[PDB]
Structure formats: structure tokens, C-alpha cells
Design a protein around this ligand. Structure first.
Ligand SMILES: O=C1CC[C@H](N2Cc3ccc(N4CCC5(CCN(C(=O)c6ccccc6)CC5)C4)cc3C2=O)C(=O)N1
Ligand SMILES: O=C1CC[C@H](N2Cc3ccc(N4CCC5(CCN(C(=O)c6ccccc6)CC5)C4)cc3C2=O)C(=O)N1
Ligand SMILES: [Zn+2]
Ligand SMILES: [Zn+2]
Lengths: 794, 364, 341
């Protein structure tokens, strides 16, 4: 197969952010790594002024600024999820700006296990080295002398396998790392010194100590305090040799603290962010003797969006980078409002991620598709309407899970979940499911502890013009609503919302009970028309030639809509695999599970049953599947890959799917769906939009062999002209990647690389197009036409 | 109450002491192809990590094993389904030749290491088969959350371990970032190695009141080897290549099974799954050798029905030291089902159990 | 040509050494009626004079044997319901604790026939048969060159009766014994016709009912005649289960022990097999490995053999452990698994 992937929406989720002096020695700069995009803004009194945006050939996992002696302005160290490490400089001359790669390399180890706490990266305050923690038991040191342009790095054996967090301590003449680790004895802080001359560890300056059982965060306090601050779920403690302080404030006991940022360069104030969206200030009280820390205290500053990271810019202005919601710029006041909150929101940066579901609808009857997506989670949940790129937000204040569109009723059916607290049960905030115009509760006759969280699931009918919540139907207690389709069944002319559910109880592992409920939205209200119990969870459902195909645990079942308006079984097919993914085209049914096992059944209408046309089982986590056409099946695979499988005259060979395409997308695709955002009515056939966890929307189409070969040759020619930031190979970037498995990319064209052909100057175009055969010899003026025609598909 | 030393059966002391022992595991790259001798008379499905004793007397196999001890101490055991498509390589880890009772017999204790698919068999001039096979790898998958995990709470991936509320906290905290995907936490729990292993441990302990390793791969292999299951599902588990899939299939098979009957007359219920108890530390069922070189997959149960005792008790070559055996056979059709083991001393326990040969039973 | 000492199988050296022996004979009266214990498990038509090796392990049987050595050393074996039987007298005995239990291994030489009057049981589980000692109908004289003159002399007076001279030559102990001995020359004895007939009857492969017949036959001449009819009638031996799988013929039968072509041997688990030795056997597949453990014929290693049509155990293949032995190989077929044709 020959496919072409392009990005219609770049990633929006902020996975990291730092602040420093990068662009100049006087301007204050904010650097944001979203997924693969680096964004450099200049901090100004008016807000932010974006100076540059760059694309990396890798997922930024570590990003830190540092200034070694003799460097006028900060350098930027970046590490990617494939372990490409680079040190970069910001070089400017006039209106031209570009990023110099001061050094680069790959710092992977051919053997070893990646940590279960993840990649950790740090820089010594004196810039004497860079320390990484990638595999258990090994601490990788990169000396930072200017002759290390290849980033040669050496490992050191760590006797403590389970390291939680690590930092470089300030005020140390010998590079010292303070880290928190866990053993069957509990959790302990421990400090080492690092010797580059002897290439090994030495005893640290102060002794090992025991800390909270769930202590998980380490802060390196600058001078004159020094020492470190260990933060857990109950207490905040401070260790510096002899000095030892501890507090157990009651305001942090509700949620874990997952990010921090120093506010003052002397270390007197810190900002802390919890999991739920609370923002605290931690204050270090200073006493003069030498200067020693007097006391600690925590003040709840307010509530922000669920913060992935924080950074204090200046003048009481804080940027909150969020993965689950829109990023924020918030002001910090000296006195609280009437609501007792010190935090005021100033600006909001849109974030479509995570996109868990979406649908293509032509709302305006205009021939231009629009994309409605379910974004965010918890209080940040939202609906997004995306069109040709313009985005409109509709906040729900609860998690949206599934979405479908009904034209006969002009409304969207959205599954949603909200978290309540057992106290009966109580809500935490007003949301769409509780602010609906009309509401109902499931009254089916079929079928804990204080303070615990419980999930309440709802079906919301939302108008398509104002996006007001017309109706809200709450399901049974302990009922998880999994699927949602809108379809006509049998001879009946009415359209329905069909919801598949499961009954989940903590004492049971695999659901044994579930329902298929049929709702009709008529004259402003919702009504259950049928309800069929099932011995298993209804994981997915589709409409199949006017019948209903549903996946119940390890079974696939065909239902018919009887004249009495009840669901009558037609046939069952049993599989070794749970049918999480259920796709239909024509009479062909694609069945997938979470372990990459793919199966292809077909329907024999005369025989009225299902038989296995083809099969392809191979252990790997699979996050989505799609049917490109009768023969080709697209899927998203672990490590952020895309695969394309294909359907000898031999029965055994004919029954096996052969993988014909592999690609590394660098994104976690949540949903595939057929559609487009461009005026309907090509060199390309088909259009599949996919949505990912980081908010990036992509398009996959199919090419001809002539076009595929032409664009592949263009790719190989461009990979020799384009200067990749960090000097990462594009062919290395796009190589299909998996745990200890790496293959070259095949069957896919990187549409972003191709579409970058226009940006390069004409001399570079002349360089690229030389000796390329169009059977005429090609010319840049023809490849311009080709690339424009390819770019006009989104 | 049990006080019998559960490490005694695993030693296979009935073969004897002073046996030569070897160390040094010999592994083959997990996707290549190799030529391996096939033991002719071993009609048994061997699963990795499972001991296999043998007493070989044919000159063919004796010469083979004498050669093998001087080379890679590895042979192949084909998982015949009726006709071989998959098998397991066994590595010799104990060895001794004797000239007992007028012939040279070589006794070897071997262990299953790797699985393979059978590409071709070639019957050498010796009447022996050499198998050209391709090694199969163990597909070890990462956590389902490693791809979608949020960095800021990667610090919360290390748990203090010491119970139900603990597993509820475990599900809540490990699969938090399951909110980013399109599936719930409980759905991901059905594919987690730890939860599957814990479920299997509990579900076994429901049968065996007095009731395994810690890594998921060894756990899955041990559970597959020690189940009261027929040959078809045994091969099904053998050809499954992932620890998670193997654990899930083991849990399903474990739930479904209900009873065991006599194979020649299927309506004669010999026992039920609740009598199965583990008298050895290797599990409820294990492979032993009788004095004439026939391997029996004996399953220990507490109570058996419709069995007639036959012959004198004897403590000769006993597979469970400290116990005798009386030949037990079905009372409806008089077909051998196993032996009835009894204590030779007082103060021991159990004073009675039944070792049923797997090939004489049929699940139902 | 045989160099193998044929007196080894008759001594049952597989039951071990240091076995205590009981010299002296005990016999009941010719017509007296006595009550005798019965071995509950052993099914066998024991013929007088025949040796029966036993290994009893049941507590009841061991107890009763222990109380027999105190009394007369006799017990009973029924023909099998049982109308006839034979008493068996112990003459060698031992008790041991081998392999976890108390087992008594003994040897019993059948002595006298009897007809069962009553069978009674005891709470101990063993049975007592109140029986009558069947007597023997010894008869007087009814009236090649040496035997030509013998037939000339002994049957002259036949001219005075209504039967020819030659016909009385078929009902004489000496002529019939000569014919039987001449027929046994190929295979390989007591002179008194009773003992000769008893020894001949116990070494035939015939099925059970024929043996019950011969046991109930009350005269020496009649028993000899029936034995000869059988030796000249039974042509082949076939699998009992199949009834058509031919195992061997009467020409291959040979006497490897001085007791005759057939003899009773006990295996390690106290099972009595009546083994017939033969040079050649057919239609048999060998199972397992050769072994010399508990070998009934010292210096030979046995190998299970079973019918290839039905996989029913027929016997064992004995193969010499050392070279320069004669015969190098032979077969021992258990009579219980055969059927003459
Ligand atoms: O805890 C335990 C459980 C018991 C187990 N045991 C002991 C044992 C001993 C011996 C044989 N045999 C199997 C083969 C064998 C069969 C019998 N034989 C004939 O000649 C023959 C065949 C048919 C009819 C009459 C006689 C000798 C050869 C002997 C098998 C076994 C066996 O499984 C064990 O070792 N320990
Ligand atoms: O010259 C000779 C000729 C051979 C003869 N021999 C040796 C011998 C040894 C042993 C048994 N056995 C008969 C009873 C026995 C049967 C096997 N066993 C199971 O457990 C078992 C049963 C069925 C299937 C799997 C295993 C143990 C008990 C052992 C019988 C015999 C016998 O006849 C002899 O002594 N010398
Ligand atoms: Zn039976
Ligand atoms: Zn037969």
C-alpha cells in the first residue's frame, strides 16, 4: 500500500516549558515544548511576543536552559524520546533567525531497561556536566567541556534501583546529586558526589535520611539556603546537613503535588501545582545569624487549569502549561478577591487534546466538512468545533467520551462522565449533566466508603446551533456507558441513539452484565424504546446493513430490529480476543483487541452467519483501527506508530494479513474517522482524519505507485538539503519503533517533509530537483505544481 | 494439614543420588533456525521451565545422549497434536549411566527452555529424526500506560507494597492516564500482568486451600504446565507467544473446567477440580518416570471416586518419598487411572492421596 | 542342544535365599472327610504334585499362613462355584518386610484331590471348605522288539474274550506310558501311572475345562488316554481374545525345566502365571526394555510380548544375558492368555 500522512492541526498540549535568556542576553524568553514543536516567545509587559517556532524530529522529553562559563546567552539542551540529545544556540542576523546545533548525539544504551519512573534529566548549576536517568541502575553523565561536540557520555552504577526523583544541589564545590529512592525499608533521601576525573560516585555531603512513605518530589534550594526540599502527600520537609525542618499542612492533603517552580532567584518562594488544579505558594522564612532557614508555610493561592507544568515569568505573571486543558497566563495579586482567590486568568491558549472521540458533520449544508471533537478531561472537558483553522469551544466541565450526530433531530448525542464524592453521593462542581434544560434518570428494574470518588455516566443531547444541553439522561449506579451509535434499524423509519453499557463492580474483574438501550429524542424529550440485557460488556457497536452489530466480551452478535421493537439475535461469532475495535465496510467486519490482534470476518447473508476471512495476531498494544478500503486496514500501534496491513491461491497464505506499511507518527492516535475539511469536488484517493492525545489532527490518504515513487524520491532528495534542528535523521525519526525493535519506514510518505519543499529557496529547489524524472526530466516549476496539488487536500 | 517436604518430589530422588550435574544455561537467538535431535518415544507436550526425567535404553538414544553431553546438552520434544507443528527444547541438567539388570541405561533429568515451530524433520540413517526448527521469542510488552503516561505524575509510578483496598488504589493510580485514551481503567486492568497474576493466584488458592514465581513469564508457564487440561488446550497455550495473552487464556480455561472423568468411559466421574492439591512445590501436576522409562503426568488429588485398588502397596521407586502406591483403575471398565498413595508412618500428612495419570482422564 | 541347567526353574530361586523348608509329609486318609482353609484369591486348577509359588500380602492370608505352620501345613485350592479342588501342602516358607508391608512367600506342592461338600466363611474373610478326599481307582492288569514280544505275551488271553488282541494294548499302563514318553522325548519321570498321569496333565497348555476334566478323572489309564488324545489333537496355540491370531504350534514346545514344558511362577506382586516355554512364537510385538529382575529363568532377560492384533499380553521373550548359551532366545507364554485350536 502507498499512503500519505500530513498534519492538519499541530500538537497543542504543552508537555514542557522553561524560562530564561535564550534569544538575547537582556530579553526574557519563554520556551514551550508541546510534543515536537519548540515555541520561543519573548516575555513583554503586554504579554508574549512569539519570536520563533521550530519542528523537531523527535518527542521532546527533556528541555533545560543553561549558561556555561564564557557563553553570552543561554544554550538549550534537548533530549528526545528516541534518546537524541542536542545542545542548541539561538543565532540571529537581521530579520533572519535560525537555530545553531552546538552539539548533538544519541545517548541510548544497547542493553538495559527503561525506568518505570521515566526519563529524568538535570544540569549541574555550575554546568560541569549533564545528568540523565534513563535505565534502572545506571546514571549517565555527559561532560560539558567544549570538546564534547559528540556528547560522549559514561554510565555509573546506581546501587539503588528504584530512584524516584533526583536533583543537583546548589552551594556544592563538588557536583552533588540528591535523590529519593524506595526499598522494602521505605523511602530514603541519599546524596552522592560525581567525579568526572575518576568517573564515579563518592559519598555525599550529608547522610541518608528516611522521609515520608509517598515522598516523591525533590527541590534543590539555591543559596543561601542550599539543601533540598522533599515533598510528598502529607508533609513538606527540608534537609540541609544538620538543619532539618518539616511541616504537615492540611491544605495539601487532598491531592498530590506534581509540579513546582521557583519564583525568586534566591529561593524564598515557590509555586506548587496539585493534580486537580489547585495552585499553592510555598514560602521559606529566612533568619540571619550565616543565613539559615527559619520556617516553612503553604498558602493556597487559587485554582488554575490542571497544570502539567508552571513557570513564573515576572511581575506576578505565571504561565500554566496543561495537557488536559487550555494553557493559561494568569496574574498573581497581593490580596484575594471576594472569593478568596489570588489568581486571575489573563490569557488562554487553545488545547484540543486529548481528542478521545470525534465526528465529521456538514452542519451548514455547504460541502465543507466540520470536525466535532471531545477534548479534555475532568473539569477541563469540552467540545470543539473545527473548520477551515478555526476552533470553537463549548465547555462541559466533565469528561466527554463518545459523540455522534443525528440529522433527523439536529442534535449531538454525547456520552459523558462526572466524578462525585460519597457523602448518597455529592458533586464537586456544576457541569453539563446537572445544568441541562431537562433531565432523567435510568429507572430499569434489571440487576463503598466515605469520601471516595464515583463515576456517574450520562447521555447528553446537545443542540447543534447554540450547543445548549437539551437533555441529560443519567444511567444506573455503577454503570459504565461504553459505546454510542445513531442509526436506523430494520424497516422502522425512526432514528435512535443506541447506548451499550456494562455493570462494573470493584469486587469483580470482568463485567458479566451489560445493556443495550435504545433512546428516541422526540419533541424535546428522550425516551427508552427498548432495553436488552446481555451477559457481558458491550465494548463497541456499529450499524450493519440495517442491523446492529455489537461486541459483548469475547463475542460478536448480530441483532435485528423486530416489529415489536425489540432486539432479536441473528448470529453469534466467538473469538479468542475481546472485540474492542469493531469496524464495518460493505459486508466485511474488522475485529481488533488491545493486543494488536486483528481479525477479518465476512457476512454470508444467505447462510446468515460469520466466518473468518483473514487473521493477523502479533503482540503489541493497539490503540485504534480503521478500514482504508476492502483490502487495506490502518491501525495505531505502541510507541506512536502507524501500521497498514493488507489482505498465493493457498488457503493458509490467503488467510494471513501481511503488514505492508510501517511508520512512526510520534503521536498516540485515539480515533480514526472518514472525512475531510476541504470543499468536496484526484491524485489521492480517500481521506481519514485521526485525532491523538496531544491534540494533533492528522490526515491519511492513499497514493498511486507513480506518485508514491515520485514523492519517495523527493523525500530522499530533501533529506539531503533540509538542515534538521539537532541534526536528527528524518529516516531515523520515522523508523517504526518498538521495544528493542526498529525497522525503516515503509509504505508511507511524510507529507510534512514534502510540503516543506515550498519553504526552501529556489537555489535549494534546483539542488533538489536535479536529474529527477517526471518520462521527461522534472523541473522545479513542475514539482511546485505537484506539491501545491498535494497541499490542497487539507 | 500438610507436613510432607514439598521439595522432595522435585528432586526425583527415585532415579538415584550421586548424579552428575551441570551448570550454564545454553540459549539460542530467539528468531533463528537450528537443527536439534528429536527424542523418539517422548509422547508428551513439554512446556518451558518444566522438568522431564528419562531412562533411555535404546542404543540410538543412548548414543545420542552420550554425544549430547559432549556438545549442546539440548534436544527437542515435539508437541504432537494427533503431525508436529510446535515443540520445546529440553536441556539436560542431570545425567548418569548405569549397567543395571543386564543393559546400559542412561538416566537424564532435563528442563524445558525454549519453544519453536517445526520447519522440517529428517529421519537420519540411525532411525532418528533431526528437526530443523525456528526459535520463537517471548514477546514481552511494556505497560499499557507507558505510551500515554503523563510526565508530571511519572513520579507516582512507584507504589509502597504490603489488601483489596490496596488493589483498588493500585488500579486508580496506575491507570490514571487511562482518562486520556478511549477506554476505562477496569478495561486496562484486564491486560495488566500484575492483576492477572494476582487473580490467578487467588483463583488457585480457592481450590488448593494450602497454596508460584513473580515474573509474569515464569508464572504463566508454571500455570500452563500444572493445569488439569487436555492436549489441545495445552498446545493452544504453548503457541501463544505473550505472557499477558497466556495469562488471560489460562484464567479463562481455569474458570471453564469443572470435572475429570475416565477416558474410556466418559460418564464415570473420577474427580472434580476442588480435590486438586499441590503436594510438590512445582505444582499440582508433574512428570515422573516409572522403572521402565514411561513418563506419566501425575496429578495429585485428595479424593477420587469409582477407582478400584489393585495389588499390594509398594514403596518401590515411589515418586513421593514416604508413600506407597496401589494400582488404581476404573471400576466400570477396569482401565488404569493412577495410583493411590498412602503414608508409611504415623504423624505424617496427608495420610492418603491419589496420583492420577493425565492420559487416563478427560476434562468435562 | 541345551547347556542351561534345567533344575534352576524348578527351584524358584527368584523368591530369594534362606527360605525355611519343612521336611516331612502329611496326608489324610483315603476316604476320610476333612475341613480345610482356602486361599481366597488364587484361581488355578492345581494338580497333585504340582509346585505353586505364592507371595501373600493381605493381612488375613498372612495371618492364616502363620497359623498353618503350627497345624498341618495344608490348605486348599478350588477349581472354579467349585465342585472339585486340590489340597496344597507347604514345604518352604519365609516372611519379610520388603517395601513397606509384611509379605509371606511360600511354596506349596499339591497333594490330594477332593470334592467339596460345603463351603463356609469366617469373619476373618478366609473360607473353609468341608470336603471329602477323592480316592484313586487303581486297577490291576486287565487280563520295538522287546515291546513286540511284550504285546505278544501280555495280550494272549485276549483270545478268550470278545475283543481283539490289539485292542487291549490301548488300555494298559505300560504301553500307554511308553507312547506318551516317546511323544515327550522331543520336548525333554514317575513310573507309577498315577504320578505319571498327574505330571503329564499339569504340563499341557489346554484350556481350563479340559484341566477340570482331567482333575475329576478318577483312573490312571483314563487320564493317560485323555492326555494322549490331547497331545495328538491340540495342533496350534492362538490368542485367546482373538481366537484366530496364531501364536505357535506344538512342535516348538520344549521343556526348559525338569518339571516339564509348563510351570507356575509367581511375579513380584504375587500373581501366579502358568508359563509354557517355546522355541518360536509369532504375531507378538515386544514392549519395553529387557530386564533380569525377578527373572524366572536365571541367566535370561525377559521382555513383555503382546498380540499385534489386539495388544493383549501373551507372555515374555527370554534372551540369554551371556553368549555361548543354549538356547540363545525363547518365549514364555502365559497359559491364561492362550487358546488351543
Ligand atoms: O510412586 C509411584 C507410582 C507407581 C510407579 N510405578 C511402579 C512400577 C513398577 C513396574 C512398572 N512396569 C511397567 C512395565 C511392566 C509391566 C508389568 N510387567 C510384565 O511383564 C507384565 C505385563 C502384563 C501382565 C503381567 C506382567 C513388567 C513390565 C512393569 C510400572 C511402574 C510404575 O508406573 C512408580 O514408579 N512410583
Ligand atoms: O521371568 C520373568 C518374566 C517377567 C515377570 N514379571 C516381572 C514383573 C514386574 C512387575 C510386574 N507388575 C505387575 C503389577 C505391576 C504392573 C505395573 N504397575 C503399575 O503401577 C502400572 C500399571 C499400569 C500402567 C502403568 C503402571 C505396578 C504393578 C508391576 C509384573 C512382573 C512380571 O510378571 C518375572 O517376574 N520374571
Ligand atoms: Zn472407565
Ligand atoms: Zn490377540
Amino acid at each position: 500500500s502507498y499512503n500519505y500522512v500530513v498534519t492538519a492541526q499541530k500538537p497543542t498540549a504543552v508537555n514542557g516549558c522553561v524560562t530564561g535568556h535564550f534569544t538575547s542576553a537582556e530579553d526574557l524568553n519563554l520556551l514551550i515544548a508541546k510534543n515536537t514543536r519548540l515555541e520561543i516567545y519573548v516575555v513583554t509587559a503586554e504579554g508574549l511576543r512569539p519570536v520563533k517556532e521550530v519542528g523537531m524530529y523527535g518527542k521532546i522529553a527533556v528541555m533545560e536552559l543553561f549558561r556555561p562559563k564564557g557563553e553570552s546567552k543561554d544554550l538549550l539542551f534537548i533530549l528526545t524520546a528516541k534518546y537524541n540529545a542536542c545542545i542548541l544556540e539561538y543565532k540571529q542576523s537581521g530579520e533572519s533567525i535560525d537555530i545553531i546545533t552546538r552539539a548533538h548525539g544519541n545517548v541510548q544504551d544497547r542493553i538495559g531497561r527503561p525506568s518505570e519512573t521515566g526519563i529524568i534529566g538535570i544540569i549541574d548549576p555550575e554546568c560541569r556536566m549533564i545528568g540523565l536517568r534513563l535505565y534502572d541502575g545506571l546514571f549517565k553523565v555527559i561532560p560539558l567541556d567544549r570538546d564534547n561536540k559528540e556528547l560522549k557520555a559514561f554510565n555509573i552504577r546506581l546501587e539503588e534501583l528504584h530512584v524516584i526523583d533526583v536533583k543537583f544541589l546548589y552551594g556544592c564545590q563538588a557536583p552533588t546529586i540528591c535523590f529519593v529512592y524506595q526499598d522494602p525499608q521505605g523511602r530514603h533521601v541519599k546524596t552522592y558526589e560525581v567525579s568526572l576525573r575518576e568517573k564515579e560516585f563518592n559519598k555525599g555531603p550529608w547522610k541518608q535520611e528516611n522521609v515520608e512513605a509517598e515522598a516523591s518530589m525533590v527541590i534543590a534550594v539555591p543559596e543561601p539556603f542550599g539543601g533540598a526540599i522533599i515533598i510528598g502527600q502529607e508533609s513538606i520537609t527540608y534537609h540541609n546537613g544538620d538543619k532539618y525542618l518539616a511541616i504537615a499542612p492540611p491544605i495539601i492533603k487532598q491531592s498530590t503535588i506534581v509540579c513546582h517552580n521557583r519564583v525568586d532567584p534566591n529561593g524564598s518562594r515557590y509555586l506548587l501545582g496539585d493534580m486537580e488544579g489547585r495552585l499553592f505558594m510555598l514560602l521559606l522564612e529566612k533568619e540571619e545569624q550565616t543565613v539559615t532557614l527559619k520556617d516553612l508555610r503553604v498558602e493556597l493561592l487559587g485554582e488554575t487549569s490542571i497544570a502539567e507544568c508552571l513557570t513564573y515569568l515576572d511581575n506576578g505573571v505565571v504561565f500554566v502549561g496543561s495537557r488536559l486543558g487550555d494553557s493559561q497566563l494568569v496574574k498573581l495579586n497581593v490580596d484575594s478577591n471576594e472569593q478568596g482567590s489570588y489568581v486571575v486568568a489573563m490569557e488562554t491558549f487553545t488545547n484540543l487534546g486529548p481528542i478521545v472521540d470525534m465526528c465529521v458533520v456538514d452542519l451548514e449544508r455547504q460541502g465543507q466538512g466540520q470536525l466535532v471533537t471531545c477534548s479534555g478531561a475532568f473539569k477541563e472537558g469540552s467540545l470543539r468545533i473545527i473548520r477551515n483553522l478555526h476552533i470553537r469551544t463549548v465547555p462541559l466541565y466533565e469528561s466527554p467520551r463518545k459523540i455522534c450526530y443525528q440529522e433527523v433531530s439536529q442534535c449531538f448525542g454525547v456520552l459523558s462522565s462526572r466524578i462525585e464524592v460519597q457523602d448518597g453521593t455529592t458533586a464537586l462542581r456544576p457541569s453539563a449533566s446537572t445544568q441541562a434544560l431537562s433531565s432523567s434518570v435510568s429507572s430499569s428494574k434489571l440487576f463503598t466508603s466515605f469520601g471516595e470518588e464515583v463515576e456517574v455516566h450520562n447521555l447528553l443531547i446537545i443542540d447543534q446551533h447554540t450547543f445548549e444541553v437539551l437533555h441529560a439522561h443519567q444511567f444506573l449506579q455503577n454503570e459504565y456507558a461504553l459505546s454510542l451509535v445513531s442509526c436506523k434499524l430494520g424497516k422502522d423509519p425512526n432514528t435512535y441513539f443506541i447506548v451499550g453499557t456494562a455493570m462494573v463492580y470493584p469486587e469483580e474483574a470482568e463485567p458479566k452484565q451489560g445493556r443495550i438501550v435504545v433512546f428516541q429524542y422526540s419533541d424535546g424529550k428522550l425516551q427508552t424504546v427498548a432495553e436488552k440485557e446481555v451477559k457481558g460488556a458491550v465494548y463497541s457497536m456499529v450499524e450493519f446493513n440495517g442491523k446492529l452489530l455489537a461486541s459483548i466480551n469475547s463475542t460478536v452478535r448480530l441483532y435485528e430490529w423486530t416489529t415489536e421493537k425489540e432486539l432479536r439475535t441473528e448470529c453469534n461469532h466467538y473469538n479468542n480476543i475481546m472485540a474492542l475495535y469493531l469496524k464495518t465496510k460493505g459486508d466485511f467486519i474488522l475485529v481488533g483487541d488491545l493486543m494488536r490482534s486483528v481479525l477479518l470476518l465476512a457476512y454470508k447473508p444467505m447462510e446468515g452467519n460469520f466466518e473468518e476471512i483473514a487473521r493477523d495476531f502479533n503482540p503489541n498494544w493497539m490503540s485504534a483501527v480503521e478500514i482504508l478500503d476492502d483490502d487495506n486496514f490502518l491501525g495505531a500501534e505502541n510507541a506512536f506508530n502507524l501500521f497498514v496491513c493488507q489482505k498465493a491461491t493457498t488457503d493458509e497464505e490467503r488467510q494471513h494479513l501481511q503488514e505492508v506499511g510501517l511508520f512512526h507518527l510520534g503521536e498516540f492516535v485515539n480515533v480514526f474517522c472518514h472525512g475531510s475539511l476541504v470543499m468536496q469536488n484526484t491524485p489521492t484517493q480517500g481521506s481519514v482524519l485521526f485525532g491523538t492525545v496531544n491534540g494533533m489532527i492528522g490526515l491519511v490518504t492513499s497514493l498511486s505507485e507513480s506518485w508514491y515513487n515520485l514523492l519517495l524520491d523527493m523525500q530522499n532528495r530533501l533529506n539531503k538539503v533540509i538542515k534538521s534542528v539537532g541534526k536528527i535523521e528524518h529516516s531515523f525519526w520515522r523508523s517504526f519503533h518498538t521495544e528493542r525493535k526498529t525497522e525503516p519506514a515503509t509504505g508511507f510518505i511524510d507529507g510534512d517533509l514534502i510540503e516543506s519543499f515550498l519553504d526552501i529557496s529556489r537555489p535549494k529547489m534546483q539542488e533538489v530537483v536535479a536529474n529527477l524524472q517526471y518520462k521527461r526530466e522534472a523541473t522545479a516549476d513542475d514539482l511546485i505544481k505537484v506539491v501545491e496539488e498535494l497541499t490542497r487536500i487539507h | 494439614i500438610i507436613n510432607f517436604d514439598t521439595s522432595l518430589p522435585t528432586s526425583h530422588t527415585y532415579l538415584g543420588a550421586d548424579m552428575e550435574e551441570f551448570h550454564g544455561r545454553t540459549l539460542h537467538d530467539d528468531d533463528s533456525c537450528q537443527v536439534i535431535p528429536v527424542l523418539p518415544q517422548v509422547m508428551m507436550i513439554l512446556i518451558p521451565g518444566q522438568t522431564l526425567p528419562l531412562q533411555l535404553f535404546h542404543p540410538q538414544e543412548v548414543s545420542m545422549v552420550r554425544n549430547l553431553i559432549q556438545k549442546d546438552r539440548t534436544f527437542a520434544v515435539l508437541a504432537y497434536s494427533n503431525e508436529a507443528q510446535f515443540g520445546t527444547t529440553a536441556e539436560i541438567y542431570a545425567y548418569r549411566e548405569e549397567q543395571d539388570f543386564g543393559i546400559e541405561i542412561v538416566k537424564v533429568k532435563a528442563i524445558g527452555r525454549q519453544r519453536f515451530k517445526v520447519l522440517e524433520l529428517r529421519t537420519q540413517s540411525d532411525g532418528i529424526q533431526q528437526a530443523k526448527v525456528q526459535i520463537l521469542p517471548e514477546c514481552v510488552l511494556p505497560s499499557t500506560m507507558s505510551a500515554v503516561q503523563l510526565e508530571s505524575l511519572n513520579k507516582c509510578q512507584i507504589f509502597p507494597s504490603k489488601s483489596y483496598k490496596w488493589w483498588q488504589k493500585y488500579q486508580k493510580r496506575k491507570f490514571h492516564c487511562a482518562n486520556l485514551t478511549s477506554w476505562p481503567r477496569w478495561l486496562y486492568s484486564l491486560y495488566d500482568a500484575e492483576t492477572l497474576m494476582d487473580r490467578i493466584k487467588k483463583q488457585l488458592r480457592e481450590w488448593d486451600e494450602n497454596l508460584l514465581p513473580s515474573n509474569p513469564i515464569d508464572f504463566s508457564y508454571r500455570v500452563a504446565a500444572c493445569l488439569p487440561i487436555d492436549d489441545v488446550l495445552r498446545i493452544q497455550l504453548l503457541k501463544i507467544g505473550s505472557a499477558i495473552q497466556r495469562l488471560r487464556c489460562e484464567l479463562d480455561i481455569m474458570n471453564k473446567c469443572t470435572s475429570l472423568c475416565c477416558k474410556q468411559c466418559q460418564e464415570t466421574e473420577i474427580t472434580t477440580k476442588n480435590e486438586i492439591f499441590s503436594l510438590s512445590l512445582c505444582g499440582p501436576m508433574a512428570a515422573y518416570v516409572n522403572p521402565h522409562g514411561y513418563v506419566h503426568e501425575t496429578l495429585t488429588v485428595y479424593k477420587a471416586c469409582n477407582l478400584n485398588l489393585i495389588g499390594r502397596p509398594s514403596t518401590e521407586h515411589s515418586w513421593f518419598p514416604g508413600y506407597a502406591w496401589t494400582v488404581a483403575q476404573c471400576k466400570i471398565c477396569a482401565s488404569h487411572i493412577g495410583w493411590k498413595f498412602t503414608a508409611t508412618k504415623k504423624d505424617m500428612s496427608p495420610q492418603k492421596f491419589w496420583g492420577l495419570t493425565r492420559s487416563a482422564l478427560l476434562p468435562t
